[PDB]
Structure formats: C-alpha cells, structure tokens
Design a binder for this molecule. Structure first.
Ligand SMILES: CN(C)c1cc[n+](Cc2ccc(-c3ccc(Cn4cnc(N)c5ncnc4-5)cc3)cc2)cc1
Ligand SMILES: CN(C)c1cc[n+](Cc2ccc(-c3ccc(Cn4cnc(N)c5ncnc4-5)cc3)cc2)cc1
Ligand SMILES: Nc1nc[n+](Cc2ccccc2)c2[nH]cnc12
Ligand SMILES: Nc1nc[n+](Cc2ccccc2)c2[nH]cnc12
Lengths: 354, 349
C-alpha cells in the first residue's frame, strides 16, 4: 500500500483527470487514490482509483494502472498495445502520453514458475501463443530480429571491461568458449532448421502470464499473456523453445543471485508433446483431421525444431545478461545468470548430439 | 514519378512489410507514382504478377516529411481496427503503408447534396462518439490559435507585396480580436468530442461502386489533425468549407464564395441528421424539444465557425512563409478574415 513521492502523485492525478472520462474529470487532488504496484528505476507501476464513495457517471473504469517508463520502439510498442487492446487480447488502453500510459487494471496475479508445468496451464499457454502467432501485425516481416540482436549483444560483450575481480573472472570463463565461433555454429545449425516466421511474444515467461481472478475454475480460459514490448516477427521455434527454457528459472529467489536454475525442470518429451498437441490444432485449425502418421511426423519435427531454437534462447539471454551486468544497476546476479544460460546451452547441445 | 532514393526506400518497405508476392518482388518490378504532397504515393505489383492471395495488389505509402507521430500512429491503428479508416499494413519511422481504397474525393459542389450532407453529418456524429486514449481537456482550439497568433506577430516576409498584405491583416488588431472570440465562445456551450478538425471535400471519399447507396457511400479520411475539441468547431468548420474550392486551376488556386455558406435550411438538414446519430435518444424527443435543441445548435455552430476563419486565417499566414507549394496563402488568409468579419456582422456579434 506504498505511496509514491508527492510530485508523482500530482502528475498521476493530472493524467487520470484529463485522460479518463466520467467521475475522473471532476476529481479533486485530495480525493485521488494511488499506490505503487512496482517501483524500480524504470517501467514503474501504480494503481489509481476513485474513492469508494464516488459513483461512476457512465462506463468509465473505477480503477486503472498507470505505467511510467522512466526513459522508434516507442511508436512500435504503443501501436502494438493499442491493436491488442482493440482485439481484446490485452488490457484496454485509456491514455497515452510521453511519460507513459494508463491501462485497464486486470484483477489477477502472475503465475509462479512451478505452475507452468500444470497441464491445463500449459495447454492454454500453447493455445494463446498459437493464436497470436496467427495474427497480422503492421511490422517488418523479415526474421532478422534473432540474429541481429545476438550480433548486437556479442559486439557489446567483446568491448566490455569490468573492474571488480569476481566479475572479470566470470567474464573470462564465458569469453573462453569463443562466443563468435559459437554464434556462427549456432547460425549454421538454425539455417538448416525450418521454422515459420510468425509474430512472436519473445518473452513468454510466468511473470508475463496473468491468472485471471474469478476464472480459476475455467479449465481452458483463465489466462492472459502480457508485456509484449519485445515482440517482433521471428521464428516460431524461438517463442516456444524460449518458453520451455523458462521452466528452468525461478526469479522469486530472495538471496543472491536472486534466481534458482534447475536443469531438471526443463519439460519432458511428454510435457513438450502435450504443449505442442495443444498448439498445433489452434494454429492449423483442421490439424486433427490428418492421418496419425502425418500428425506424428509434424510433431516429431516440431520437437526437434523448438529444441534447437531453445539453444538460441540460452545464447541470446546469456549475452544479454553479460551486457546487463555492465549497464544495469538492478540487484540481480547477472553474471551468474549468464553462466547458468551457457551451462544449459552446452548441456542442451550434448543432449541433441550437436 | 518519385526521387530514385524514395523509390528505393519505398521498394524495401513494401517488400519487407507486406505478405505474399511482395516478399519476392525483384526491384525493377516495383511500380510507384506520386499522388500528393507529407507525401502520398501508390505502390503496386505489376499486372503480370499473380497474388498468392489475401495480399493487396495496390497500397498507399505515406511519408511524414517535414510526440506527434506516436499519437497519429496509435490513432490510425485504432480506426483501422474499428473498420473506420483504411487498413494499416506497415508502420515505420518515416511513414506507413495503408490500404488503397478504390474511391474518388468529393468536389466542393457535392457537399450540399442532401444525401451527401446527411451522410457527412452521420459519419461525423459517429467519429465524435468514439473513445480515444487522448487528452480530453479541450485545450486544442485556443492553444493552437495562441501559438499561431504569436508566430504571425513575429513573422517577417522578404517580398514587398507580402509585407503589404500582412500589414492590412495586422491592422485588425488580432490579439484584441482573439479575446473577443474567446469571450464569445466561453459563453457558448459545446460538448467536447473527438473531432476531425479538417472535414472538407478533399478528405471525404466517394467509395467506388457504392454510388447508389443513399446512406453509406463515404469514408472520412485523413485524421492527422484530430483532437478532443468542441463539437461546434468541427461542424462550423465543415460549414465554412462550403465556401472554398481548392481545384481552381490558376492563381491563387482557390475560389472563395461567401454566398455558398449553408443556408438555414441546409444547416437544419445537416444537424437533423447529426443529432439522432450522436444522441440516439434524440429521435424520441417531442417535436418542440427537438426544435429548441436545433435552434441552440444553429447559434452554437455558427459562432464556432468564427474560430474556423480566425484559426485558418492565422495558419495561412504562417504557411505563406514556409510552404513553397503553389497556392496563394496570403490571399486565402484575407479571404478567411473577410469571412470572419462578414459572419460577425451577420451574427450581431
Ligand atoms: C525479452 N528479454 C529482454 C529477455 C531478457 C532476459 N530473459 C531472461 C530473464 C528473464 C527474467 C529475469 C528476471 C529477473 C528478475 C525478476 C524480478 N524483478 C522483476 N521486476 C523488477 N523491477 C525487479 N527488480 C529486481 N528484480 C526484479 C524478474 C525476471 C531475468 C532474465 C528473457 C527475456
Ligand atoms: C486542420 N488544418 C491544418 C487545416 C488547415 C487549413 N484549412 C483550410 C484550408 C483547407 C485546404 C486547403 C487546401 C489548399 C490547396 C489544396 C490543393 N492541393 C492538394 N494537394 C497538393 N499537393 C497541393 N499542392 C498545392 N496545392 C495542393 C487543397 C486544400 C487550404 C486551406 C483547414 C484545415
Ligand atoms: N494491466 C494490468 N492489469 C493487472 N496487472 C497485474 C496486477 C494485479 C494485481 C496487482 C498488481 C498487478 C498487470 N500487470 C501488468 N499489467 C497489468
Ligand atoms: N487510403 C486511401 N485510399 C484512396 N484514397 C483516394 C485516392 C484514390 C485514387 C487515387 C488517389 C487517391 C485515399 N486518399 C487518402 N487515403 C486514401
């Protein structure tokens, strides 16, 4: 129930008063209710609401989420959020302004990492993912995001110099793998791994999945995927592979390095099959009406596909994490997260026999 | 034809943003011609190229040229999603790809046809009712008039005849006049609504093959100046456009005709169509109550029309300095002010 600093309170009041219709337009500053949802140095969240004793005038919301950035991609993220809201595939957009936005408040909690493996959950994550992999979005259709971003991080990574000895020591270990050659070896493997270019979330982890309040007894319609800011047209294998990788990481751990990694929490073949059996009919529409041997061939190939791209999830977020150790001031063990992603990378390679 | 650099940029945008036969277009294959310009262009496959299906054969490319883009972009995307504007096919830093709508623009003379007018009023009402994630304080109208007035007072032209016209315009005492206008409009109730702000014939498409529809043959396009504004401004502004023909083939490249302003009857025809499309419980009011609403509405829009003359008059002065396009802006500015003083005389205000 934490209060923002009184200058933020005033700015939030004005945005709510001017952007929101109905009882909000005539609210005084002293009637305004706000509490921090999440702090941090950027992308801060607040809940704003009317007094309980204030009646609504029409269909205006009683309660909204304020998102403050704390600063091209700005236009792309804004248009995407607007489109998704229009398609009921995300929170409504109530206000956009240079410092942030006002969004629909969705009563909910995020999933915990252990919940990702629950069959009803997985099935539904697979369906939602298939669904927006299917949609049209006014963005560049060339799949350059994946390797373009890896190349960009690699370049930054090679330029990095740390001063603190345990960071320099850890950086020496990661560099000793020859990351540029590893990149090329990975590129070449993925060039021979067919994967359809689709519109990808790119960050489908539990923290970005909402368990809808009141819908816990719905078997197949209780979730919403959020936080599409890293979306792009990309290889389907990445979006799915990346999601499977996230089974292994728990970001709620309270001691340094502030995550737990468990190589044994990666989904089993049966768990993967259950995920892709739910994905496939939702994305192909009459997939169930194929011969069993053809369904099977598609499924076995898609498993190879997402498991090879899972390797790009490790390599890419490994590199990202090294970069974060340099530029971020967040309390998170970035170097240790990097080493965990590379460990998983080579363990995955050995498993696949590549 | 366009600049060979613009041709190249445009070719890559179509190739990378659009599905099907666009994805493997070779380069010598790209058809593109200029259509306006904030430049517009038509991009197409050659006739020879068959579609892989579902992808447009023709598209419009828009370049912004000389944050506003964020708002305009979100806005266009919303209208496309709602089926109110052209579809959005690509969005990028310098501009966008849009659906090409087989259509032509209306001519000035067509604004006054009863069916056209009735439908313009209905589309406007519908545009007005919609919710948009933008600032709802109606600060647009006078904020923009202030900003242009300030620039106009600093403006200096090099050429003598422009200096001479600016001097006549400045002698009306525009700062005092702005305050009289403000005070008149602060006492004229007008609901705040999502306004188009530029509802003229150049921005209204007559849809191809739909010419026989009495009530559904048009789309309002080009909403880049949109904002929450007083409803009276959009309407009065639209009325003032009955006076101006922008297809005049010689200098100053417009005809102004004060007698073409809608008559009371034509105004009533427009608002009788607007009201039931904006309120919807309006059709069920008593006859006398409708009559009261309409007569107040005539005063309302006619008074706001003064702000259309005043604002675009000032705007036109600034454009004279910066726009190298061919249009006599100083003469248009004078035409708007003549109209402003005539309308004040007509109103007793
Ligand atoms: C799409 N991108 C840029 C990705 C980057 C990294 N990954 C791997 C990954 C995922 C989550 C996390 C992570 C770390 C900490 C948290 C917890 N947390 C969440 N919010 C905050 N403000 C936090 N401040 C400190 N810790 C905060 C949540 C997620 C770290 C790395 C996936 C995608
Ligand atoms: C909402 N805003 C910014 C407005 C500004 C001015 N007005 C009044 C007005 C409207 C149209 C025009 C105008 C002028 C010329 C044209 C013709 N035209 C049309 N397209 C071009 N590329 C032209 N190049 C030269 N002339 C061109 C069309 C409309 C001038 C003033 C209304 C709204
Ligand atoms: N638009 C949103 N609505 C709800 N949540 C989740 C949320 C629930 C309870 C408390 C705090 C946050 C979001 N998390 C991110 N966006 C939203
Ligand atoms: N999206 C559009 N589709 C069609 N027109 C009108 C148009 C037709 C033929 C040639 C030139 C313009 C527009 N004018 C502005 N936008 C459009």
């Amino acid at each position: 129930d934490e209060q923002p600093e009184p200058r933020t309170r005033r700015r939030a009041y004005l945005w709510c008063k001017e952007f929101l219709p109905g009882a909000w337009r005539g609210l005084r500053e002293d009637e305004f209710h706000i509490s921090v949802i999440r702090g941090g140095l950027s992308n801060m969240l607040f809940q704003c609401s009317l007094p309980d004793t204030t009646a609504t005038l029409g269909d205006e919301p009683r309660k909204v989420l304020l998102r403050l950035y704390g600063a091209e991609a700005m236009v792309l993220e804004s248009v995407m959020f607007a489109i998704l809201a229009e398609r009921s595939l995300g929170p409504k957009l109530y206000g956009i302004f240079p410092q942030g936005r006002l969004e629909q408040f969705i009563p909910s909690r995020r999933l915990d990492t252990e919940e990702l493996s629950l069959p009803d959950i997985s099935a539904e994550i697979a369906e939602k993912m298939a669904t927006f992999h299917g949609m049209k979005m006014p963005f560049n259709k060339e799949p350059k995001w994946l390797f373009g971003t890896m190349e960009k991080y690699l370049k930054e990574v090679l330029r990095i110099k740390f001063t603190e000895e345990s960071r320099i020591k850890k950086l020496h270990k990661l560099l000793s793998y020859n990351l540029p050659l590893e990149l090329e070896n990975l590129r070449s493997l993925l060039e021979s791994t067919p994967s359809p270019v689709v519109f990808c979330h790119n960050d489908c982890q539990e923290g970005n999945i909402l368990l809808l309040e009141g819908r816990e007894n719905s078997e197949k319609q209780k979730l919403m995927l959020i936080d599409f800011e890293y979306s792009s047209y990309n290889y389907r294998g990445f979006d799915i592979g990346n999601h499977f990788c996230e089974w292994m990481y728990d970001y709620s751990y309270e001691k340094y390095p502030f995550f737990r990694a468990n190589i044994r929490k990666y989904p089993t073949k049966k768990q993967q099959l259950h995920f892709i059996s739910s994905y496939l009919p939702a994305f192909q529409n009459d997939f169930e009406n194929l011969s069993t041997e053809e369904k099977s061939i598609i499924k076995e190939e898609m498993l190879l596909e997402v498991n090879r791209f899972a390797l790009a999830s490790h390599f890419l977020w490994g590199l990202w994490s090294i970069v974060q150790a340099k530029i971020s001031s967040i309390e998170f063990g970035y170097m240790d997260y990097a080493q965990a992603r590379f460990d998983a990378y080579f363990h995955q390679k050995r498993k696949l026999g590549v």
